[PDB]
């Protein structure tokens, strides 16, 4: 009965971009995996010879899901190459917009991209809304009545009876599936909250446009600071604060309680999807030139040795091309990067992806929520420690539970809760600075003829870095090394499997035609392919 043979999932849906996952399964469990990115755009080639000021506008287009992050990375990169120290208000505003991006991104990921792997939407039709309301009100200070939940059931029922399932068309859960465990009531609660999230995210996104112009693709950053003088007004700050308070209430009363109910029901997922090494860049600075001045601090960990967090050395990163569709096999540090495409087809000459393979000290590293949380916890971060301990106590599990697909999903939640609270602190600090009479948001600068610079951002998916080599005042070389490249890139010239490839080994596959288990682990990493290849 246990299946043995190949499984290909192309396209992997409910992620950003074009991913092809190939695995070899033996006796119902995965024994080998390949992460193949199937679209190349070549933004780094396009950037050559252009004005450095223009970079952020091209690079933001690397991705629309993690929208503002690349604009911030490029700007921090040119700010750095140029030697400018932006005003206090510029850092506050840039930080507040990034904080809002995290809340919007994670809420949408849990409900809209991840949840369908655990929730059987059709099973909500057979639930008792009165019992479901009892359950919902017991897990949250927010009380919901039988009437509240019946309203959702009625809407869902009519939709299903049309025969046009749309997004749910050939869903892996249709007709039931052995890997789906939720009872009808919990499925109904989760569905009501999925629908509710669709509207709440518009408000979470709006928060970014208050200071940022619009979302997607913000337009308020410039070398030297920001352009939004309107962000200084009490009216705009109040508008932002109101959106923030509502978004935080949703995180606290809806997202987290749901995460915990689902995790408790899927406790067995603490046994799959673990990884060995972690890297994180830190985020929310007080000093733009000091990574250790950030609310979350940078750090690297090998083989889960969290008692020995090592410092982050930027010169230790090299991107490999041996198993990628580029010329040759020489790995390069970003300031000496090369982007020379040469397609050989799937596995042609042992190459199978458009993504390069970043290695730290020759090692494959996981980056993202799990790495930021575990590293900050280990560094003694008070807020991260408090919330993680509460989550572990609620679930009745040990810390070892974190090294898994369930742990990675939980860490995304923990990160959202801590950041939501922190935006409130950053806001007060911003308010206090304005109160002192500081109304400056942009500083003057000058373009050098020859220089090098780098910008670091810890985005919702992990450590992001943009690298520039300026020659004759123009872009001599520009290279992007993004979170997903780290986690979803292919094997290197030493044949080390990437974090996603390695975590898939040992994954059970109940059915082989509806491999939801592969999706559970792949989605826990929150893949972004446009980001990874660029």
């Amino acid at each position: 009965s246990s299946y043995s043979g190949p499984i290909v999932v192309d396209p992997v849906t409910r992620i950003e971009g074009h991913l092809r996952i190939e695995v070899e399964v033996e006796n119902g469990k995965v024994k080998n995996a390949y992460s193949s990115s199937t679209l190349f755009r070549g933004l780094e080639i396009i950037l050559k010879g252009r004005d450095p000021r223009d970079a952020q506008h091209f690079t933001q287009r690397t991705c629309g899901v993690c929208t503002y992050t690349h604009a911030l990375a490029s700007t921090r990169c040119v700010d750095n190459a140029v030697g400018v120290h932006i005003p206090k208000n510029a850092t506050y505003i840039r930080n507040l917009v990034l904080g809002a991006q995290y809340l919007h991104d994670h809420i949408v990921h849990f409900y809209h991209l991840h949840a369908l792997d655990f929730v059987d939407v059709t099973a909500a039709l057979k639930a008792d809304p009165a019992k479901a309301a009892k359950v919902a009100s017991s897990i949250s200070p927010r009380k919901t009545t039988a009437a509240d939940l019946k309203a959702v059931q009625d809407k869902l029922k009519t939709f299903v009876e049309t025969g046009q399932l749309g997004p749910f068309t050939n869903a892996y859960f249709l007709g039931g599936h052995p890997a789906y465990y939720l009872d009808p009531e919990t499925n109904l609660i989760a569905t009501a909250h999925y629908l509710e999230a669709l509207r709440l995210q518009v408000k979470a996104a709006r928060a970014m446009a208050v200071f940022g112009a619009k979302n997607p693709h913000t337009q308020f950053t410039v070398v030297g600071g920001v352009t939004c003088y309107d962000a200084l007004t009490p009216q705009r700050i109040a508008e932002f604060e109101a959106l923030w308070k509502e978004t935080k209430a949703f995180v606290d009363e809806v997202y987290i309680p749901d995460l915990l109910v689902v995790a408790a029901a899927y406790k067995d997922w603490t046994q799959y999807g673990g990884t060995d090494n972690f890297i994180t860049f830190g985020e929310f600075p007080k000093d733009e030139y000091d990574l250790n001045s950030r609310f979350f601090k940078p750090g690297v960990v090998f083989k889960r040795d969290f008692k020995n967090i090592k410092p982050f050395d930027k010169m230790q990163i090299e991107e490999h091309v041996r198993h990628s569709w580029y010329e040759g096999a020489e790995a390069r540090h970003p300031w000496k990067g090369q982007t020379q495409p040469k397609y050989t087809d799937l596995h042609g000459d042992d190459r199978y992806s458009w993504m390069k393979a970043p290695r730290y000290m020759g090692e494959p590293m996981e980056t993202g929520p799990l790495a930021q949380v575990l590293i900050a916890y280990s560094q003694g971060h008070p807020k991260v420690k408090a919330v993680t301990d509460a989550v572990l106590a609620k679930l009745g599990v040990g810390p070892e539970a974190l090294f898994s697909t369930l742990g990675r999903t939980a860490a995304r939640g923990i990160e959202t809760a801590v950041i939501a609270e922190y935006v409130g602190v950053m806001l007060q600090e911003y308010k206090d600075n304005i109160a002192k009479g500081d109304n400056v948001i942009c500083a003057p600068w000058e373009m050098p003829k020859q220089a090098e610079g780098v910008g670091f951002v810890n985005a919702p998916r992990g450590g992001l870095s943009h690298w520039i080599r300026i020659e004759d005042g123009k872009i001599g070389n520009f290279q992007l090394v993004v979170p997903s490249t780290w986690t979803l890139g292919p094997r290197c010239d030493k044949n080390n499997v990437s974090p996603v490839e390695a975590s898939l080994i040992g994954t059970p596959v109940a059915d082989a035609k509806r491999p939801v288990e592969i999706l559970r682990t792949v989605h826990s990493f929150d893949p972004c392919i446009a980001c990874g290849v660029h």
């Binding site: 999932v9 192309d10 396209p11 409910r14 950003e16 971009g17 074009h18 199937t38 679209l39 190349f40 755009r41 080639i45 396009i46 000021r53 223009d54 091209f58 287009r61 690397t62 629309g64 929208t67 809209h112 939709f159 046009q164 399932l165 749309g166 997004p167 749910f168 068309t169 050939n170 869903a171 892996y172 859960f173 629908l195 669709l198 509207r199 518009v202 996104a205 970014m208 446009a209 208050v210 200071f211 112009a213 619009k214 979302n215 997607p216 693709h217 337009q219 950053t221 600071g225 352009t227 003088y229 495409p341 397609y343 799937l346 400056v440 948001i441 942009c442 003057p444 491999p515 446009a530």
Partner: protein, 267 residues
């Protein structure tokens, strides 16, 4: 996935960043939930669909072959170089998938500057030979309604579809095939700072007092005078727009803006 009542929509992703998909999620009155539940039947969409792999391909095949017909909404440019090798989904080139699916649609909407004119990946030296939908598929007679912008205002997509469903036809289009009801005016003629422009009151730098006072951004490279879009009127996320946030327009709804509007900070 398809049947009677609700109109069928097939959403395709070529060489794109997903910013156009995200913009539709920002829909406001109607919101996205109303759109998917009552207004239309979203039958294929790689970003939010439940099915994956062969099941997704099956869902796609099912939608495109329906006797009820479908409307195609396309995001991203089509890479043409080296036989279309630079972009593949389910191991088929994007050129091939679009060549066979688009001619079968009742109507096709190219959503976003990438899908309409080539976009970011088509900028010099265009390594992948990326093209806009109408350019790449001219030989096949494909003529998509172009909704430009990077990303466009979602108000423009919903407005166009609602018009098509009501009138069973495309609205009036300009020479670039964009609806005149949303792209008939330059951003500049609708700008709150136009009075400053007329007075020659230009901000010389972003840190200046004139910038803080809201002076015109033309000297700082604003492309508003050469760009067609409805940004100052509709605004984004019901609250803001590039120049109201103090930054110049980069001409994102125009044909080869990455090369034509660059350097962004010069006029």
């Amino acid at each position: 996935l398809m049947g009677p009542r609700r109109p069928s929509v097939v959403y395709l992703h070529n060489a794109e960043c997903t910013g156009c998909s995200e913009s539709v999620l920002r829909a406001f009155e109607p919101y996205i939930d109303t759109l998917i539940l009552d207004t239309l039947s979203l039958d294929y969409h790689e970003t939010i669909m439940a099915a994956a792999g062969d099941a997704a391909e099956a869902a796609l095949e099912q939608a495109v072959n329906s006797p009820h017909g479908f409307i195609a909404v396309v995001e991203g440019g089509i890479p043409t170089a080296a036989n279309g090798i630079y972009g593949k989904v389910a191991n088929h080139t994007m050129l091939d998938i679009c060549s066979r699916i688009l001619p079968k649609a009742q109507a096709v909407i190219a959503y976003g500057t990438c899908a309409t004119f080539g976009g970011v990946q088509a900028a010099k030296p265009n390594p992948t030979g990326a093209k806009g939908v109408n350019d790449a598929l001219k030989h096949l007679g494909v003529k998509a309604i172009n909704i430009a912008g990077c990303p466009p205002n979602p108000y423009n997509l919903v407005g166009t579809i609602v018009y098509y469903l009501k009138n069973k036809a495309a609205p009036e289009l300009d020479s670039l095939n964009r609806p005149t009801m949303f792209f008939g005016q330059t951003v500049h003629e609708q700008c709150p700072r136009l009075p400053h422009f007329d007075a020659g009151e230009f901000a010389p730098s972003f840190e200046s007092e004139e910038a803080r006072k809201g002076w015109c951004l033309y000297e700082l490279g604003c492309k508003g005078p050469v760009t067609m879009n409805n940004c100052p009127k509709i605004k984004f996320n019901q609250t803001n727009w590039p120049v109201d946030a103090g930054h110049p327009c980069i001409g994102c709804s125009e044909p080869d803006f990455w090369d034509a509007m660059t350097p962004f900070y010069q006029n």
